[PDB]
Each structure stands twice: as structure tokens, then as C-alpha cells.
Design a protein around this nucleic acid. Structure first.
Lengths: 119, 38, 249, 196, 160
RNA sequence: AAGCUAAGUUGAUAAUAAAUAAAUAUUGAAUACAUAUUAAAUAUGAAGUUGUUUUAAUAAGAUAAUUAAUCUGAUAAUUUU
RNA sequence: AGAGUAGAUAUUGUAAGCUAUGUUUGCCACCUCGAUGUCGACUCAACAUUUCCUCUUGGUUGUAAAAGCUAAGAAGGGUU
RNA sequence: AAAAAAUAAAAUAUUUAAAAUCAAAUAUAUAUAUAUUUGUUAAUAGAUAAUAUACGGAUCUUAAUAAUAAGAAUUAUUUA
RNA sequence: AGGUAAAUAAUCUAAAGGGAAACAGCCCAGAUUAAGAUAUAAAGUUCCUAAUAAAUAAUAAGUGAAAUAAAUAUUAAAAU
């Protein structure tokens, strides 16, 4: 290994904060998507925008992917997530079966919340 | 002195000491049991 | 009446504390030093001749160091100069040769225009000789040991064989054009250059040389010479310092 | 803790005082610190001697039954607790020395192995198998005396100093195993090997 | 418009005292603080192209704070160029040789920007192990501060 | 003969001391004991270290003179240490 | 484990285990493949310390002594 | 021997875990029903080559007294 | 193995910019020409070097502070 890819094995505090923020943003996006759908469905039934926003009973999304994203068991929120799953991917060939998320290529775009139950 | 990584006390008369940032095992009975952690 | 001045509170209200003494101070260095307890005298190496011991019969080569107008010009002290030393002056010189400033200096110190001046550093204030006095060969005792400083014979631009005792290359068996050119310098590649202090041809001699623990064979105030056992660095008429041996008593 | 809690008995002749130092010094560890402020003294019949001690420690002198106690401001602080047991023990040792006096008998074992007072008590010459002469000067406070040539006695008010001196004396020739042979401080023993 | 006026006072080299006995900062933090002053970053008239930093007189430098076991561990290196001449001195040894002021100076040097003005900036730092120093008389002072200081002390300082 | 040489002559291995590595200790709690401290105190100990010693480089400092019927240098001449 | 009289750890240490190293035999073709310094000698060494001797020191029924054995510190000097 | 008692400072271990259990929280019916999520070790030694120490460098672990004033610049989890 | 044989994705190749000390391929991000006020990305905010202040733990070893070295020993810490 003569070429030096000087990437540290762990993240800085600032990196971790940025990661957390990014995670929070994707959750927010999902929430917005569900909310807009609900609003649209209220409008279709025949309420005003404000009335729809007020509504006690929020409509859950019917499409599959959205419904999965809504579930925390499948796609957890940043507040829900463990410290470890925010900053460590599962890597079967690593010692500890764990690897920094920053070592994943395009980790800033690519999402990866859920690790295996005991790894 | 047996200078080694592993430093276990052999007999009851052995006693462990922590000096100079090194674990020593001295012994009051058997002088062969003198060890030092690196 | 008083002049205008302002002073900072930070510098006024600063609690007074003396600085700790440092190794690279003069006074510490002086304390460390291995020095003789007595002054010396400047001499000229007049030549060399045999000394026969009349009891035993043993012959020893002795250098004849002449002592002429040797005089304590002034001396230096720890409080002013940082060390204790006696500025000795040797011989007599013309007006013509000596600088106006030097002549004035000699007049102030009340000595004749001098042929060679040199310091002789000592341990204590007790070792200092009163200034103006004349130092004669009887200063030293016969049989005592002395250190001897002088500038060696100039050898000119010398080769590595004469400088450093390099073996050189072979005389025969194919050797071409480098019989004496000691080879292999600055290793190769690993250093990438000639590492400092690589023994190379250069100028040799004409440098100072202390010779320690030389025995004073003979002293006589009549002929104005100190006999000294063995060799002394430099040519004839070269100036030679002489002080008690620090190593030998 | 268990040592420091033990109260010290004093006889009327001896006085255990305490007072602040002229210029207190601070011992600085990596994380923790320790400011030496107070200075305990144990004055008595045979002599007087002192212990420089931290600020957190302080005495508790009782008039009744001749007892005095020692306590620290925080026993749950580890360093303080460690100091407490030390200091109490030290002042007990001092008390013992001033009232009774500490002793250290050195018995020399070997053919021509013996001690001698050379400089009228001020230098213990020791001859223990060496061409060169061996020995060392007695410190201040220590008084040495030789009932026999082969049995020296060191005596002093400070338990630390006397026993250090004894150890130094021994160090010229500690007991060999093959023949029980050398310098034995107090009740010192050695398991003798089989000759063969 | 803002720049136009008499700029002589802005570019004036002031003299800044720091009694190390009083200052509670550790060595490195103190050195870093000094470095800024030496550069002239504290003053708004600063420009990278122009050296415009003040003098800093450090005093009672023997009482400088050093954390951990750096006083007996921390090694200062040196090398001429000839191999086998790496000179490694521990902090305490360096102090014994020169002083605590030398140590501070080294820190300050390392803090400073690596260019032609660095040496000048380093020179402006004036460090002293104890209290007494020649620059006593030239530290910045004000008339409003004079009431705090007792009467004869000022006179003694002036005499000195 | 000189010179230069080494086959020759002479000198020298640079003390003392400072802190130390390994190692050997004293008092001593935390931790009834015990433990040389990876607690506070207290000791020793190396062809190593710091020094010392020597050589060279520098030039803080010092004494001395200051417009020259003789100031300090330099060119020039005669040479050599 | 097994030697080592009697005892695994005085000294010995299998097979396996975990590392280090970056000296060698490889392996790779990534360098130029206008790098002989063509691999050995001589001249000259410099450097490391993973210490051969020399200095300090622990153990060594396997240190009585002397030889040693073994280990620690140690690269100052020296090593045909 | 030696206990204001346990509530907590005994030993002998196993252990190094939020699966389980427990606590905290989300989600559904909701006067607390289920399901999902989150919560369980530290330091030293081991340590190891060759031009030169090399966290990029300086340097960073804070201390009442006492400055307008310092107090990680390391690691773990977070805030603005 | 900077290996080799394909598969897949991206970049490079043919991509200037910011980050990763330096840096073909990694992390960001795509130069039409300016300009430089407003958001920022990746990455950072004691100094060098643009830019910060906090909480709460834990570390004392300079461990560490952008290139995480192991079986094992020791000392601790929780828990059962």
C-alpha cells in the first residue's frame, strides 16, 4: 500500500454533527412528503388547505415505499437511531464487523440507517 | 529477573508491585519468581 | 521640578522575584571550568638540544623556551569581564611596528611596547599576580609539569595520505592514476551528498596545539631560558604559552 | 482510613503542635494537586522533629485521656485518604522516637567482618572483605555505638533516617545465601542453601 | 474615506507587559496569545503585506505553567546536517541551559507565520526569567492608572 | 649541511562534579497487613548522559587613539615563519 | 507438552497460536527500462543496535570460587 | 477479634450483556392496554532498524490565592 | 500485493474548484465573462491558518490530537 489514502478510521465531532443534520433532513423530507399527500387527500374529500392542516386524523400513505419509510423499524429517525448506527456501518470483512460510515463511498448522499440486529 | 510481557505471580510468597510505570513481581521465598512487565 | 512620566500598574505592582541561574551564564561556566590556580608566561621557542641527567646518565631531547621582558600588563576579573585572567606581554618591540592605539594602551598599563600579548586564565582572584611585575624563568620549579600552547608548523595544502594517514591505492596490479587519491567519499546515493566533515585534502598545520603534562627539565634566570622536556608545536622563534598542568597537579 | 482513624496517645512531656509554613509549596500531579501548608512538630525529651503536611489534614487535640486525633476534609477523596494514614503513622513514629528512641542493631557475620568508629563517632568505618577501606559519615541526629566489633548499634529520633542509614551500611555486604555471611539489620533472616 | 487621516498612532509599536506570575494560562496558550500580538492581528489597521505588530515583554517567566509531565519528558530537537548529530534536550535541561524564557520563545516562534518578518516578530518578544528588566520604563501607561500605584514605588521604578 | 620525513622523539584517552538507565533501598498509607512511590517524604547506582578536555568559528565584553610635522590600513620593494 | 538428577518457566521449549521486521528466496511489473557503478577485491567509510568484547545489574537445587549460563541497561570505545 | 446495624465499602467466582429483564420513549385503543425504538468497560504493557525528532508544525491535560482574564487544542454523547 | 480475472457503481481517463498536510482515481462539487452582497457543500473554527462558544461524561498515558497493531498479562470498573 504505497499510495496514501489518508482517511482516518473515525470521524471528528464536526463531521458527526453534519451527519446527524443530514439524517434529520431526510426524515424531514419524508415527513413533508407524507404531509403533502395527506393535504391533497383532504382537498380531494373537500376541505380547505388550512382545514386539512388542522385535521385531527392524518392520512397515512398508501404507496408501499412511503409506508415503509414511515415505519421506524424499517427506516428509523435520527432521534430514534442508536449512536452506533449514525456513525458506523456494518462491514462483514472488518474486525468488529463494523466500519465508519465516512468510509462508505458517497456517504453524504447515500442513506444507511438500519444495521443487522446483533452486528 | 524474568523480563516478559506476561507477569503472573507463581507462589503465595510472590507479591506484585507497580513502580516506574512497570509491573514488577518480586517474591520473598523463591528468588527465581522475580519478573518484570516489559 | 520633576520630569513627566507615567508608569503601568502591571509593571509597578509586579511582585519582585530574582531570575534563576542558567548554565549558559558566564559565572556558571567559570564554576564548571577546569583551570590552573596560578598564572603563566609567554615564551619563544628558540630551539632544541640534548639534556643529559648527570645522576642516571639518561639523555632527553629538550626544547629551549626563552623568557624575555615577560610582564603582567593587566588582569581581568569576574565582575567586569566574566572570568579571572592575567594579560601577560612578552618581549620588546619598536615604536614603528606598534599601532598608536597600542602604544597608548602600553603607556597606560606602564610597560614597554610589547612583542606578543596573551591572556592566562585562572581559577580564583588569588591566582592573579600584581600588574607591572616581571616574570622570570624561576616562576616555574624544576621537575614540575606544565601545559604548553603554540601554533604548529604550517604544512600547506596537504593530501589525505599526509592529513589523515589514508592507505591509498596499490602501487602495481593495474592501479591507474589514483595511487594516492583516497577514494570513496559521501558514500553513494544513501546520503545523496558528501556528509559534513568528510576527510578530504586541504590545508594542514598552522593551528594551535596544546601539549599537556610536559616536564620542566631545567630553569635558569642567567641565560633567560626554560628547558622543557620533549617537543613543542611550531617553528623556531614561535611564541609559546606556558602554564601549570591542570591534569598533573 | 483504618490507620488514620486510630487515635494517638501522648504523655505530658511531649507536645504535638501544628502551624502554617513560612512559604507553602504545592505538589502538582497530572490532574489532582496537593498544597503543603501546615507543619506538624513533635517536641520531646530526647529531641524535636517535624513533618511538613497538606492543608486538608488537621489535628484534633483533646485534653482528656491524652488522646489526639487526625482527620481530613474529604475522606472520600482518594489522595487525601492515602495521605491521612501516612501522616498519622509518621507522627506516631516521631512520638515513639522522642519518648523512647529508635534503634537499629547491625550484626556482622564472617571471618574478619566487623565495624569500627573511626572519627570519634562521626564516621562508621566498616571492614567487610575489601582491599580499599569502606564506610560512611553518620548523619545529624544519628548516634552510633559499638558494644562489640562485630555488633554495631545505630540510634536516633527519626525512624526513617536511622533505618535508611542501617540499610546503607548493610549495602556494602548484604547476607550471602551459601554461608550466612554479611551484615544483618535488626531481625533479618536468610534461607541458607545446601553446601554440596 | 475611512482610511484618510493621521495613521501614525495606528501603526505605533506599543509595548505589552505580561507578568507570567500573575497570568494563569499554560505555556502554549500564552505563546499563542503572544503570537497574535506580535503579528499585529489585534489591531484593525493590520494588513498581511505590512509588519505592524507590537513589542511583548514577558517577565517572571520562571513561574510559567506547564501541564502533565512535559517538564521532564518534552524533548526539544536540533540537527546540524552531519548524520549522528541529532541533539535532543528535555525541557528541564533546556531551562537549565538558558531559562523558561527560551522555552516560551520557541513556542512563540512556532506559533508565528513562516516568512521574512518572522525573525523580526520573534525579536520583538523580550522574555525574562525573573522580575528585573530594562524595558520596565517603556510599557504602555496612562495617567488615570497612577492613583492605583503607591507614591515611592513609581520613583524607585523611574530611578531603576 | 639544511629541509622533510618515520624506523625515531614527545605528548595525550580530558579529571572533579550534576542528574540519571538498568538495578539495589528507608519510612510509608491508600489497602489492619503488606508495598523502595504507577502516593507524600527519603537513598544509592553505568565505558552511557550533562559537563570537562582539546580544536576551530564567532566577537558580548575589555584596555587604548581619535583628522594625523609619525593617524589605522592598502598598493610597491626585500623575504619567511 | 517435553527435557533439565528431584522440579515445566536455573537452563531448556516441539506441534499450534499471536505479532514484528522489510535484510533474504520469492511474488508483482509500478519506476527508467541510454540505473554498468555490471555480483568480488581495494579506498573509504556512514549509519542501526537486533550488545561480540568492554561498564552497570537480576536469576542461576542447575551462583562456593573461578570459569560460566541466562536476562536488563548500555552504541562511549573497540571488534584481525 | 474489630458491625448506627445496611442503605453502602467482605470474600469466591462468573460476567462484561438491553437478546432477556428493567428504565426511557414512539406508535396504536387510550385512564395505560399491546407493538416498535433507545440504554451495558477503562488504563498500562505488549511497542520492535538503519540520513533526522516529525500529531503537517507550534503546542495542547490548569492552580484557591489573584488580573476583564486561563482552565484541552484528547476521547464519548450532545447544544447554539 | 499499487496483484491478477471479470461483475457493479463512481471518478479519472477527458474536469478546472473546496477538503483529505502534499494528493490522476477518495470527500464534496461541475469555470460562458465578470463581480463578490446573500445562502451554503465537503471539511473545519488556540496559533501557523479564513472562522466558536457550551453541556456532560471519561482519560493521565501526550494514550491521543487525519494513515486506530495482535494473542496474551496486569491493574482497575461496573454487573450477576
Amino acid at each position: 500500500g504505497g499510495l496514501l489514502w489518508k482517511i482516518p478510521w473515525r470521524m471528528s465531532t464536526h463531521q458527526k454533527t453534519r451527519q446527524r443534520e443530514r439524517l434529520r433532513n431526510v426524515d424531514q423530507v419524508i415527513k413533508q412528503l407524507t404531509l403533502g399527500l395527506h393535504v391533497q387527500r383532504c382537498q380531494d374529500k373537500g376541505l380547505t388547505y388550512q382545514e386539512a392542516m388542522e385535521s385531527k386524523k392524518k392520512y397515512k400513505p398508501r404507496s408501499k415505499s412511503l409506508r415503509l419509510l414511515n415505519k421506524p423499524s424499517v427506516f428509523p429517525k435520527e432521534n430514534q437511531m442508536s449512536s452506533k448506527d449514525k456513525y458506523w456501518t456494518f462491514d462483514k470483512k472488518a474486525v468488529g464487523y463494523r466500519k465508519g460510515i465516512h468510509k462508505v463511498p458517497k456517504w453524504t448522499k447515500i442513506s444507511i440507517r438500519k444495521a443487522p440486529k446483533f452486528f | 529477573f524474568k523480563v516478559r510481557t506476561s507477569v503472573k505471580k507463581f507462589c503465595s510468597d510472590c507479591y506484585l508491585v507497580r513502580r516506574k510505570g512497570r509491573v514488577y513481581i518480586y517474591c520473598k521465598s523463591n528468588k527465581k519468581h522475580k519478573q518484570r512487565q516489559g | 521640578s520633576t520630569r513627566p512620566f507615567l508608569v503601568a500598574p502591571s509593571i509597578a505592582n509586579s511582585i519582585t522575584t530574582e531570575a534563576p541561574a542558567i548554565n549558559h551564564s558566564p559565572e556558571l561556566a567559570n564554576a564548571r571550568k577546569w583551570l590552573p590556580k596560578r598564572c603563566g608566561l609567554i615564551t619563544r621557542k628558540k630551539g632544541m638540544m640534548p639534556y643529559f641527567d648527570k645522576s642516571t646518565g639518561e639523555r632527553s631531547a629538550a626544547t629551549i623556551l626563552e623568557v624575555n621582558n615577560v610582564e603582567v600588563i593587566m588582569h581581568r576579573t569576574s565582575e567586569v569581564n566574566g572570568y579571572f585572567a592575567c594579560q601577560v606581554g612578552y618581549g620588546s618591540r619598536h615604536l614603528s611596528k606598534v599601532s598608536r592605539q597600542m602604544l597608548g594602551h602600553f603607556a597606560s598599563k606602564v610597560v614597554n611596547p610589547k612583542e606578543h600579548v596573551a591572556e592566562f586564565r585562572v581559577k580564583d582572584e588569588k591566582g592573579l599576580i600584581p600588574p607591572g611585575t616581571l616574570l622570570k624563568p624561576s616562576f616555574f620549579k624544576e621537575g614540575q609539569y606544565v601545559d604548553v600552547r603554540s601554533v604548529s608548523k604550517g604544512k600547506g595544502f596537504t593530501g589525505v595520505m599526509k592529513r589523515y594517514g589514508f592507505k591509498g591505492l596499490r602501487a602495481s596490479h593495474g592501479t591507474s592514476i589514483m595511487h594516492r587519491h583516497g577514494g570513496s567519499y559521501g558514500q553513494n546515493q544513501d546520503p545523496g551528498r558528501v556528509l559534513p566533515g568528510r576527510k578530504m585534502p586541504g590545508h594542514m598545520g598552522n593551528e594551535h596545539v596544546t601539549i599537556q603534562n610536559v616536564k620542566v627539565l631545567k630553569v635558569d634566570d642567567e641565560n633567560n631560558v626554560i628547558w622543557v622536556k620533549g617537543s613543542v608545536a611550531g617553528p623556531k622563534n614561535s611564541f609559546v604559552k606556558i602554564q601549570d598542568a591542570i591534569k598533573k597537579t | 482510613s483504618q490507620v488514620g482513624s486510630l487515635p494517638l496517645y501522648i504523655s505530658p512531656e511531649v507536645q504535638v503542635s501544628i502551624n502554617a509554613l513560612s512559604m507553602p509549596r504545592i505538589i502538582r500531579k497530572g490532574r489532582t494537586s496537593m498544597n503543603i501548608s501546615q507543619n506538624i512538630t513533635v517536641k520531646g525529651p530526647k529531641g524535636e522533629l517535624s513533618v511538613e503536611v497538606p492543608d486538608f489534614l488537621h489535628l484534633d487535640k483533646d485534653e482528656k485521656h491524652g488522646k489526639i486525633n487526625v482527620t481530613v476534609q474529604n475522606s472520600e477523596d482518594k489522595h487525601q485518604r492515602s495521605m491521612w494514614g501516612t501522616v498519622r503513622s509518621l507522627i506516631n513514629n516521631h512520638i515513639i522516637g522522642v519518648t523512647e528512641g529508635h534503634l537499629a542493631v547491625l550484626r556482622f557475620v564472617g571471618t574478619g567482618y566487623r565495624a569500627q568508629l573511626e572519627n570519634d563517632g562521626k564516621f562508621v568505618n566498616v571492614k567487610v572483605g575489601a582491599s580499599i577501606k569502606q564506610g560512611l559519615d553518620v548523619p545529624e541526629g544519628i548516634v552510633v555505638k559499638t558494644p562489640a566489633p562485630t555488633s554495631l548499634i545505630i540510634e536516633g529520633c527519626n525512624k526513617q533516617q536511622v533505618l535508611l542509614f542501617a540499610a546503607k551500611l548493610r549495602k556494602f555486604h548484604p547476607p550471602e545465601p551459601y554461608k550466612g555471611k554479611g551484615i544483618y539489620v535488626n531481625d533479618e533472616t536468610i534461607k541458607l542453601k545446601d553446601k554440596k | 474615506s475611512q482610511k484618510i487621516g493621521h495613521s501614525g498612532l495606528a501603526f505605533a509599536r506599543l509595548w505589552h507587559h505580561v507578568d507570567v506570575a500573575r497570568d494563569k494560562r499554560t505555556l502554549g496558550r500564552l505563546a499563542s496569545a503572544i503570537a497574535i500580538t506580535l503579528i499585529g492581528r489585534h489591531k484593525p489597521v493590520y494588513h498581511p503585506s505590512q509588519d505592524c505588530g507590537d513589542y511583548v515583554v514577558v517577565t517572571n517567566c520562571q513561574k510559567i505553567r506547564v501541564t502533565g509531565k512535559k517538564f521532564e519528558q518534552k524533548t526539544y530537537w536540533s540537527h546540524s546536517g552531519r548524520p549522528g548529530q541529532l541533539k535532543l534536550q528535555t525541557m528541564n535541561k533546556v531551562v537549565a541551559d538558558k531559562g523558561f524564557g527560551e522555552i516560551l520563545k520557541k513556542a512563540v516562534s512556532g506559533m508565528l507565520p513562516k516568512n521574512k518578518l518572522r525573525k523580526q516578530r520573534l525579536d520583538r518578544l523580550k522574555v525574562f526569567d525573573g522580575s528585573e528588566n530594562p524595558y520596565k520604563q517603556n510599557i504602555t501607561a496612562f495617567a488615570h492608572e497612577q492613583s492605583s500605584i503607591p507614591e515611592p514605588l513609581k520613583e524607585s521604578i523611574f530611578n531603576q
